[PDB]
Each structure stands twice: as C-alpha cells, then as structure tokens.
CSV table of C-alpha atoms in Angstrom, one decimal:
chain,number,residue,atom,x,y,z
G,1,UNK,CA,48.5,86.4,39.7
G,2,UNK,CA,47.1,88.3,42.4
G,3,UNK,CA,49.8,90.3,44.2
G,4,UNK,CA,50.5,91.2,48.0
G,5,UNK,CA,52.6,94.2,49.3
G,6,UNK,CA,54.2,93.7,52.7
G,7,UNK,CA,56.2,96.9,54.4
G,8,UNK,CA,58.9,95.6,56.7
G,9,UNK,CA,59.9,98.5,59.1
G,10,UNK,CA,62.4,97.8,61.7
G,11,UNK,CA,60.9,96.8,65.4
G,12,UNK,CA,58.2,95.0,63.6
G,13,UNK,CA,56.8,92.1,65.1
G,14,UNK,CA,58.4,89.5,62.8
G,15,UNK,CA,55.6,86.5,63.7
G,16,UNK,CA,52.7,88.9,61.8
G,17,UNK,CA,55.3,89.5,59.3
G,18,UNK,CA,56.1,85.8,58.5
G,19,UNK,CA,52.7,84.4,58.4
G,20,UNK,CA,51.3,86.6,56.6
G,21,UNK,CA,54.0,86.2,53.9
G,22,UNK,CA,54.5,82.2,54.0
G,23,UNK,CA,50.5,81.4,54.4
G,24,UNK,CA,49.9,83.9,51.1
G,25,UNK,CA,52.8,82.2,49.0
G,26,UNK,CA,51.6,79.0,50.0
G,27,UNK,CA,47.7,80.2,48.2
G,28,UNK,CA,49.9,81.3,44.9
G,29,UNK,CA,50.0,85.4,45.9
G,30,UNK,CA,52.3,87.1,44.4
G,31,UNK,CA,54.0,88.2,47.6
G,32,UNK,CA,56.8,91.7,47.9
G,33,UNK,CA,58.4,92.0,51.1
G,34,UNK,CA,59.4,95.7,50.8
G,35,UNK,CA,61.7,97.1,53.5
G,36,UNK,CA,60.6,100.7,54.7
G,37,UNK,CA,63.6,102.2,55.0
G,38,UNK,CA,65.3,100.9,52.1
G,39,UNK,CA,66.8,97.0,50.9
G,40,UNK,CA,68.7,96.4,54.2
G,41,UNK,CA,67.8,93.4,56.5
G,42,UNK,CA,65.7,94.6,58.9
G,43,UNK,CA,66.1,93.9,62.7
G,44,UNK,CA,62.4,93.2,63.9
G,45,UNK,CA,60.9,93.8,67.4
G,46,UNK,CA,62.3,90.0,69.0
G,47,UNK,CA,65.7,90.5,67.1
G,48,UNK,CA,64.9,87.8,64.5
G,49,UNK,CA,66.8,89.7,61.3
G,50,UNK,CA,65.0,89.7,57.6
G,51,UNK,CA,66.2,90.9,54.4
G,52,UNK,CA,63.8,92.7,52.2
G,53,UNK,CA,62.8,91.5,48.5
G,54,UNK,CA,63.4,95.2,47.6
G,55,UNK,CA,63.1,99.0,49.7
G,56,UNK,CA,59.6,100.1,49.1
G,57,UNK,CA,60.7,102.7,46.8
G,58,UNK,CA,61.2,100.5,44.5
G,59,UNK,CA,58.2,98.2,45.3
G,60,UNK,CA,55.7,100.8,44.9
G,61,UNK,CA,57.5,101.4,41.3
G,62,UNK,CA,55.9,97.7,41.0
G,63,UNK,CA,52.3,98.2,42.0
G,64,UNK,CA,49.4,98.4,42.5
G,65,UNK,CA,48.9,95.6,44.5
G,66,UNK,CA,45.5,93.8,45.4
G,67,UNK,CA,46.3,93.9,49.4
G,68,UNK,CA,48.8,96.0,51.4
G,69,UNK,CA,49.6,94.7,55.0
G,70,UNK,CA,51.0,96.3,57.7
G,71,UNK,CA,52.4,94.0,60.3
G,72,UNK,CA,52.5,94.8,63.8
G,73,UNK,CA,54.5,95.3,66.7
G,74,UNK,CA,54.5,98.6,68.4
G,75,UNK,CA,57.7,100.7,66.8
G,76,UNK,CA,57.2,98.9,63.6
G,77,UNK,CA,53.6,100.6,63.6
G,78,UNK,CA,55.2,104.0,64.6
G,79,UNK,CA,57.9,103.9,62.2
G,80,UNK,CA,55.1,102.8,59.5
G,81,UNK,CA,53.1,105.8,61.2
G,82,UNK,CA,55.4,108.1,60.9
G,83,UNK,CA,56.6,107.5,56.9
G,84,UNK,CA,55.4,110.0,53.8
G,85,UNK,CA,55.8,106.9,51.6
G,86,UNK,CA,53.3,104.5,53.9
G,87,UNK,CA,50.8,107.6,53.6
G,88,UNK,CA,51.0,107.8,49.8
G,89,UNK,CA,50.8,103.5,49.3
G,90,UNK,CA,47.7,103.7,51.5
G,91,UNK,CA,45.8,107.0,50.3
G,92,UNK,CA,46.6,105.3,46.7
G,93,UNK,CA,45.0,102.1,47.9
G,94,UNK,CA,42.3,103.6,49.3
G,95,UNK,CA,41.4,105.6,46.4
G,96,UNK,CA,41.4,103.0,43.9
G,97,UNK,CA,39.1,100.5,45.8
G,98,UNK,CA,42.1,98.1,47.2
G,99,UNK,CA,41.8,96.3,50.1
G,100,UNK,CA,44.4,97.3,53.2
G,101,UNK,CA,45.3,94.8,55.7
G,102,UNK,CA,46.5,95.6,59.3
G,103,UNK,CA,47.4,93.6,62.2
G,104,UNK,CA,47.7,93.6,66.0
G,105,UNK,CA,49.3,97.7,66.2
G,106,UNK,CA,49.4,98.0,62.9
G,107,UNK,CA,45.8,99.5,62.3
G,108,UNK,CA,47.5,102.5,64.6
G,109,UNK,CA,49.1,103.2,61.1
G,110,UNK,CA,45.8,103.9,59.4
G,111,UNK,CA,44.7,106.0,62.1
G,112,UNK,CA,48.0,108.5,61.4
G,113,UNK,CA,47.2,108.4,57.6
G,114,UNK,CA,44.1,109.2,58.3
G,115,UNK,CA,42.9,106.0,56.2
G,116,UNK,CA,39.6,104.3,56.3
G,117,UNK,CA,37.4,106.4,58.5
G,118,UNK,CA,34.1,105.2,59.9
G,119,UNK,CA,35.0,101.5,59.5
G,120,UNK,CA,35.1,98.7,62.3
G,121,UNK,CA,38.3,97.5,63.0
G,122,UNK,CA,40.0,95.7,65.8
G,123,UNK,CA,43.4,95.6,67.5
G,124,UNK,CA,45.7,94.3,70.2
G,125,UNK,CA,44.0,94.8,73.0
G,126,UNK,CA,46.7,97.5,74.3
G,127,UNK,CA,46.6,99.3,70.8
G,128,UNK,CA,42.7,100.1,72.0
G,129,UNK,CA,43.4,103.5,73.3
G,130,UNK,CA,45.4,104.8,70.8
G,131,UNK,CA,43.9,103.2,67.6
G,132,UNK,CA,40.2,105.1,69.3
G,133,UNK,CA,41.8,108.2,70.0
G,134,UNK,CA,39.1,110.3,68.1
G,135,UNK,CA,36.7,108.4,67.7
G,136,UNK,CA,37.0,107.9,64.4
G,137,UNK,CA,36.8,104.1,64.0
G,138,UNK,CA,34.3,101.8,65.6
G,139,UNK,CA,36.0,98.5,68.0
G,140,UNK,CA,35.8,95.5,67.5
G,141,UNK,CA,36.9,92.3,69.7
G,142,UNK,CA,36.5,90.2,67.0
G,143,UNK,CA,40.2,88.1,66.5
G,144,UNK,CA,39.5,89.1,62.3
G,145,UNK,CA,37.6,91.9,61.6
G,146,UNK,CA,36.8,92.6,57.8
G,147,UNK,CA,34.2,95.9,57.0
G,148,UNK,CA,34.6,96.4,53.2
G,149,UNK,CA,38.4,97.2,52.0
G,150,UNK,CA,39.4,97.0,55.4
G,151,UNK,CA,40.9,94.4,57.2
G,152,UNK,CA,42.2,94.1,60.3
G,153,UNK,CA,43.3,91.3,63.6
G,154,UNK,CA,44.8,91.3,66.6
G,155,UNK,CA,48.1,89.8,67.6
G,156,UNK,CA,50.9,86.9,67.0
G,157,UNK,CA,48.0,84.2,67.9
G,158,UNK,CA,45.4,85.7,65.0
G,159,UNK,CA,47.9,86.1,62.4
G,160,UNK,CA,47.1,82.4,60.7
G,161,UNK,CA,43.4,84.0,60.7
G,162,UNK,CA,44.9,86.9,59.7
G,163,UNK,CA,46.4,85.4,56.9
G,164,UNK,CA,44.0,82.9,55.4
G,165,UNK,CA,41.3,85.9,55.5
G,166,UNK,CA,43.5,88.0,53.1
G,167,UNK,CA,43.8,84.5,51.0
G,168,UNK,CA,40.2,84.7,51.2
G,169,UNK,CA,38.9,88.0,49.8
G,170,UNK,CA,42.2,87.5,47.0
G,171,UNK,CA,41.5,84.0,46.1
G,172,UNK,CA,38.2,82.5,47.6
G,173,UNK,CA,37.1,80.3,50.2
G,174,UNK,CA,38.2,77.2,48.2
G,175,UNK,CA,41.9,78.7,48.1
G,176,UNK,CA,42.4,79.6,51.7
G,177,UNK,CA,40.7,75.8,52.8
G,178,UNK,CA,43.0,73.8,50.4
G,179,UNK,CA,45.8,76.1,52.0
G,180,UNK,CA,44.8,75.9,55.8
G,181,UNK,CA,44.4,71.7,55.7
G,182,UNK,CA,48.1,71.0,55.1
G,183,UNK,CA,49.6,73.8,58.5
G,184,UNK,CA,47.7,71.2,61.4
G,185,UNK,CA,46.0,74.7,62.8
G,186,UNK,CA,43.2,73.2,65.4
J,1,UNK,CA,69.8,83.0,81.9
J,2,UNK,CA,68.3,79.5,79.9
J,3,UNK,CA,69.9,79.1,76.7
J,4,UNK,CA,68.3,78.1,73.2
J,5,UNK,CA,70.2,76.9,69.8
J,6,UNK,CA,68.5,77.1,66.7
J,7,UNK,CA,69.5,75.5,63.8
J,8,UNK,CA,68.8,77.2,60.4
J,9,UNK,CA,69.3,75.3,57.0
J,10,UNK,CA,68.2,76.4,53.8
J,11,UNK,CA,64.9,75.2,52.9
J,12,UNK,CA,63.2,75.4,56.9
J,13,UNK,CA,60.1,76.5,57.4
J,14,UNK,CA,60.1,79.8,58.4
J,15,UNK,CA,57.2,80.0,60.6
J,16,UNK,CA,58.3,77.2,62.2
J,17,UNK,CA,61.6,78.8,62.9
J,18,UNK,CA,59.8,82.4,63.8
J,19,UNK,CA,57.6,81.6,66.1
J,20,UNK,CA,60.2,79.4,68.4
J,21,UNK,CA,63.0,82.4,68.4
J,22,UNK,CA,60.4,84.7,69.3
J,23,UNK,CA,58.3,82.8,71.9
J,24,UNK,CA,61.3,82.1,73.6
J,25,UNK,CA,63.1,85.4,73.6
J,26,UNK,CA,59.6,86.3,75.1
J,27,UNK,CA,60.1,84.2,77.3
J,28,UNK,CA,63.8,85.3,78.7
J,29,UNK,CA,65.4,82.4,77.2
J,30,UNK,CA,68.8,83.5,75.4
J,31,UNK,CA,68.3,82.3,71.9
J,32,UNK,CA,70.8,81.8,68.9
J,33,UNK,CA,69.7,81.5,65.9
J,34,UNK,CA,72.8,79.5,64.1
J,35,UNK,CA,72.7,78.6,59.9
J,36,UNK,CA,74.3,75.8,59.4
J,37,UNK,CA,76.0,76.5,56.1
J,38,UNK,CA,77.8,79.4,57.9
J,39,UNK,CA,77.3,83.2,58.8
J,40,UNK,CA,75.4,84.0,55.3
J,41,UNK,CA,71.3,84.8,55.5
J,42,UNK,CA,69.4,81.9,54.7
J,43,UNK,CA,66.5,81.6,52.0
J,44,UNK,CA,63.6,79.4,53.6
J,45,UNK,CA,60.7,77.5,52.1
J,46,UNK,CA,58.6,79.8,51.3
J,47,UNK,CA,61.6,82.3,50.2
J,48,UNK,CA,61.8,84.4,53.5
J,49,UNK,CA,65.2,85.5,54.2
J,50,UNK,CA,66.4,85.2,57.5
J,51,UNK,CA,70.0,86.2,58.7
J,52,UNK,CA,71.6,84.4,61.3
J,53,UNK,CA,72.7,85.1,64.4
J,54,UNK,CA,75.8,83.2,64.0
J,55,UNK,CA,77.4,79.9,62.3
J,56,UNK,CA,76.5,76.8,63.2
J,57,UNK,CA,80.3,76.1,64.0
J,58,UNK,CA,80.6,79.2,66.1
J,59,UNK,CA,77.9,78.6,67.7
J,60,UNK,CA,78.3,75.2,69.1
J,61,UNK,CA,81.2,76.6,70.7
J,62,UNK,CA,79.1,79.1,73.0
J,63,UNK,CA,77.2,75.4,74.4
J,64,UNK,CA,76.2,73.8,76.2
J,65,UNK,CA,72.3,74.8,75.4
J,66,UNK,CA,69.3,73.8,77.3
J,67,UNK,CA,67.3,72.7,74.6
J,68,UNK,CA,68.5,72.8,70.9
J,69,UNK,CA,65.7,73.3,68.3
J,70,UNK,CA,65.4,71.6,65.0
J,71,UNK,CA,62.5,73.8,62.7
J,72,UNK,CA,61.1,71.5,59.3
J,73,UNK,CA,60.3,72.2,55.8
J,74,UNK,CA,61.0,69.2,54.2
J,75,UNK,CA,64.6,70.3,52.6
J,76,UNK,CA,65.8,72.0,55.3
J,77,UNK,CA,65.0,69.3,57.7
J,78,UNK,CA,66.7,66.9,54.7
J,79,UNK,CA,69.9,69.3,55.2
J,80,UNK,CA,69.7,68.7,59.1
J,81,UNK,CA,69.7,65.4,58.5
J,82,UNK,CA,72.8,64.7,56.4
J,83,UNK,CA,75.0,67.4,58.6
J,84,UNK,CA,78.0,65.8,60.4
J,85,UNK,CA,77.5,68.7,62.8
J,86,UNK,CA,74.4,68.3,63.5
J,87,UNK,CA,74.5,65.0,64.5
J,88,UNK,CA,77.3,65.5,66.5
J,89,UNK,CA,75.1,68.4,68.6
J,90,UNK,CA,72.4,66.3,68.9
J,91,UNK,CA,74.6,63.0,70.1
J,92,UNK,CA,76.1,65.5,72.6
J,93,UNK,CA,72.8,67.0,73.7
J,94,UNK,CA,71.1,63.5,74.5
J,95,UNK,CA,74.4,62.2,76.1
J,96,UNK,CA,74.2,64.9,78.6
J,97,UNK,CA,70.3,65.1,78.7
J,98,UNK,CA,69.4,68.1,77.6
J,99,UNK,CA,66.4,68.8,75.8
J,100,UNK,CA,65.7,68.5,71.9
J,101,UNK,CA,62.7,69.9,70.3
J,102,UNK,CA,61.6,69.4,66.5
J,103,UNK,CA,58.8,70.5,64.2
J,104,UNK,CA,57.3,69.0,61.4
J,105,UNK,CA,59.3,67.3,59.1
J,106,UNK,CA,62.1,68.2,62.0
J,107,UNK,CA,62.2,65.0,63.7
J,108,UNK,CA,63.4,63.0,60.6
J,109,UNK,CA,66.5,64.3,61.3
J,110,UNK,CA,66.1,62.5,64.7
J,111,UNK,CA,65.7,59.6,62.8
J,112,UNK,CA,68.9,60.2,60.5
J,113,UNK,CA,70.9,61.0,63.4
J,114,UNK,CA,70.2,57.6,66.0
J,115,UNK,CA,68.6,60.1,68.5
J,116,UNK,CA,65.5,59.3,71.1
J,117,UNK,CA,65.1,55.7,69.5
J,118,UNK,CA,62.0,54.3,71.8
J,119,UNK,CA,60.8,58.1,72.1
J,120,UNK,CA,56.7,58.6,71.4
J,121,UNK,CA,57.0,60.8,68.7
J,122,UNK,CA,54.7,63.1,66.5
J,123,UNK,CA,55.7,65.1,63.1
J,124,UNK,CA,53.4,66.9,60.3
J,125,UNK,CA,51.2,63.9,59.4
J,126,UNK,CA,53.0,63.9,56.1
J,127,UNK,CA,56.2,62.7,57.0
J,128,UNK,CA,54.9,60.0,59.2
J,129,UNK,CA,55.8,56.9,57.2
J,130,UNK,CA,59.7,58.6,56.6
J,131,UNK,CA,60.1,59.0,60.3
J,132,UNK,CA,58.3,55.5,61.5
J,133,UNK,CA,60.5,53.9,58.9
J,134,UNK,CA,62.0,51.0,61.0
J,135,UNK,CA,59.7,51.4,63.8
J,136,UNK,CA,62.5,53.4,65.8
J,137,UNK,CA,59.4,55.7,67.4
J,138,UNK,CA,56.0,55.1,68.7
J,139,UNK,CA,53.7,57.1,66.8
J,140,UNK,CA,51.6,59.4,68.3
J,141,UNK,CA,48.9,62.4,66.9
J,142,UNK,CA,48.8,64.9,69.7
J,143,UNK,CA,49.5,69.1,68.1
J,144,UNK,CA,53.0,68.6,71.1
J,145,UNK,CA,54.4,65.4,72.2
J,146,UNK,CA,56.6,65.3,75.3
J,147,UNK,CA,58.7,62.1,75.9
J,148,UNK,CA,61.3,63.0,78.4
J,149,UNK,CA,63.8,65.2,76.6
J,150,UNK,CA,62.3,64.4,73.0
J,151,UNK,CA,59.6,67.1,72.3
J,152,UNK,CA,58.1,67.1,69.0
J,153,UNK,CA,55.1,68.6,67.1
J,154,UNK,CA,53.5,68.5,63.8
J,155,UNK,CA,53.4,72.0,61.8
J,156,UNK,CA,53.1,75.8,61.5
J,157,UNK,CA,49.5,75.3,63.0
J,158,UNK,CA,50.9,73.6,66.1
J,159,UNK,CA,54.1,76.2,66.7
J,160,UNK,CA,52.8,78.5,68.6
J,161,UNK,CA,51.9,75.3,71.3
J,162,UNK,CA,55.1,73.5,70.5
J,163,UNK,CA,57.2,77.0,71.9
J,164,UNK,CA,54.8,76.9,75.0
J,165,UNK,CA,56.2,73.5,75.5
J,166,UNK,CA,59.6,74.2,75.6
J,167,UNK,CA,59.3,77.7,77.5
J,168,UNK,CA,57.3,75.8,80.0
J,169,UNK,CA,60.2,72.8,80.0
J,170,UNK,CA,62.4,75.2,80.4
J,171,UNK,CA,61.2,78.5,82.6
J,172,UNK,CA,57.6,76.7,84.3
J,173,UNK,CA,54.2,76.6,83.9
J,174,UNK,CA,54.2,80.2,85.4
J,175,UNK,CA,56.4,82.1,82.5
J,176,UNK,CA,55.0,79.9,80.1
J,177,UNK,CA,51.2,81.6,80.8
J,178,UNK,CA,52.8,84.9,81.2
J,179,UNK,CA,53.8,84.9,77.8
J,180,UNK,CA,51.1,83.3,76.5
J,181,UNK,CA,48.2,85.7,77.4
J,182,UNK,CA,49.9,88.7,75.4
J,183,UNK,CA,50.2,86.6,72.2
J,184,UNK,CA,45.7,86.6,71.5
J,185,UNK,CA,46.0,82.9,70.7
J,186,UNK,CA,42.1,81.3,70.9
C-alpha cells in the first residue's frame, strides 16, 4: 500500500540499487523498478545486468509514488542528471509534499534539477565537490541524513541504512525493526 | 587475473548475489555470473531480475575458478541443492582445493552435495537446524566463518564482510582494504 519508485539508469551502482529494492519489498512497499531509458535490462556501473519492471514512461503513467530514489554510482547520477523526465518526476514530487530519496552520487541529481534547495544532505565523500558546487545545500557527514522530504546517504556500505530509513518515514519504526532483525546487519 | 563463478538460481537472494559480483569485480577478480537453468534472466527472491552472464553449462567449461560462490534465499539455495551440476562443480572444486564460499541459506547445498563435512560452519540463523541435520558441521555464530577452503556467512547483513573474505582469500589483506575504504561501510 505504500509505493516506491526506483529509476534504473545504466552505469548505476547496482548494490544502492538492490538494497534499496529488496529491504523495501521485504517491509510490504509497493516497489517499481523503472528503467530510464526505456524497458531494456540495464548494464549497471560493476556489469551486474537488471531488467526493469517497466521504462519510466510508463511508470510515471502509474504514480504518484510516496518515495522516489535515485541510486548512485557516478554515470548513473549523470545520466539521471541529465534526463527531462528525472526533472519532471522530481519537480512533481517536490511540489506535492513527497519525500525524494538519494544515495551516495545520486543527490548530484537533485542538484541539476535544481530540487530541494536549502536542505542538508550528505554524499559519497567524492560527490562533496560537485553536489556543493553553489552553495546551495548544506553537508552533512552523517552516513543517513534525513531534513524534511529529503533524504539522502552515502555509498554501497549505507545503503541498508539507506533502506530501512525510507521503510521508516513509509511505514514506521515498528516496520523497518521487524524488517532489519531477520538480514544479521551488526 | 583470479577468477570467480557465481551460481544463479531462481529464487537467490539478490543482495546476497549483488554485493559478491560487485565487491569482487572491485576487487580485480574476473567474475561470471552463471544461471543455472541456462542463459535466460533470472527472477530472485525479492523479484529482482538479474541476467546472466552465461549458463551454468557454459560456464563450467571456462574453469577451473578460484573460488566458486553459492548466494541463499531459501528456494534458490533449494535449486542449488538438487542440481546434478552443481554438485558436480563443487565435488570438483574441493577435489582440487579451491575455495567455496556460501551465504545464508547457501551452505545447505553444501550439505546436499557431501561437501566440507567436518567444516566449522555458519549460515542465516534460520536454517541452522536444516544444515546441522546429521551433525556433518560444527556450528559456529561468527557474521564470516573461514575453515580452510569452506567460507560461509549468515545473510544480506553479513555480505558485504563475507566478499571481504573472499577478496582477501583470494587478492590479500592489502586489496581487500583498498576496496573496502571506498565502499563507506561503518
């Protein structure tokens, strides 16, 4: 019942892809794994090849959805970066009060839309410099860093934190422990 | 130049599968990502879709591998587990002692297939009593256990350490920290 929109782009870091999508089934989300550039599998940034649910055009026929997450991984960012379609999902979800979620250099995505100015956010540590080119978001080294509708981590090694923080502000705190107890995380 | 077979049934745990293939091809390690039932993409647990490198049957052709990797879910590591060709990798591995790592519910295919008997084993705490039926193993709950060639570990939470392990068994300590510090783990 709630539901989760994931854009798959190709060079996209396909550990902040996966988690993200399992952990979220796993709490009952509603989960479309939309492929950028349209319902071909998708070669991500380590080679590891997915195939879609559907192309986001169709997808975004399908919303709105009560997260959107951009994984990582650097040309998946830019390709995510440089799409039309990204910029409309996000200035939609912004506008209507839904929450965005963007990992490790994914956040470099909202930064080109132009999407949630003025909030803290964190990202891999080598995204730093581009993600704060401007000025226009405040840094964070926090692993998860959450201000309002926007929510954002760092790399492969946050994306269960990542994860179970979207399940979080979807589901509650009661959700994301029942889910977390049965992966062995430390 | 080390090499890495991965076997993919329906059913596997994708994160489990994931975070191996790219850990290792972080790592330098030539990975290939084989699906057992042949070429076709494979639907996993949690209904990611993951296409194959190659067949399992092709694939065993290319050996011999340094290590060969065995991801769980509990069906796909019940497909594993009644394969003909898998068991005949994994006789073929241990006769020439190479390494075999499995995850999770992955080691009950150990079980199924005669391999490591009198190993010190660990798997997701859930499928403890399936694998120590007999009392084949010596149970053990460390996140990664290490017995010689038999490398096992216990879930998506422990993954991320169970792919250190076998980039370390395989490349050093040395690569094994170089990939590490890029990934953010805690």
């Amino acid at each position: 019942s709630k539901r989760a929109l994931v854009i798959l782009a190709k060079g996209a870091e396909e550990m902040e892809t996966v988690i993200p999508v399992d952990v979220m089934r796993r709490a009952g989300i509603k989960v479309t794994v939309a492929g950028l550039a349209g319902k071909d599998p998708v070669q991500c940034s380590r080679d590891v090849v997915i195939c879609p649910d559907a192309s986001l055009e169709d997808a975004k026929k399908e919303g709105p959805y009560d997260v959107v997450v951009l994984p990582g991984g650097n040309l998946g960012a830019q390709n995510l970066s440089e799409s039309a379609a990204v910029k409309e999902i996000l200035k939609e979800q912004e506008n209507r009060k839904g929450l965005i979620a963007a990992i490790c250099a994914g956040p470099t995505a909202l930064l080109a839309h132009e999407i949630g100015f003025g909030s803290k956010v964190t990202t891999h540590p080598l995204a730093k410099d581009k993600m704060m080119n401007g000025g226009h978001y405040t840094y964070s080294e926090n692993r998860v860093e959450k201000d309002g509708l926007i929510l954002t981590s760092r790399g492969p090694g946050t994306s269960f934190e990542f994860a179970l923080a979207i399940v979080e502000a979807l589901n509650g705190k009661e959700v994301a422990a029942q889910v977390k107890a049965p992966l062995v995380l430390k």
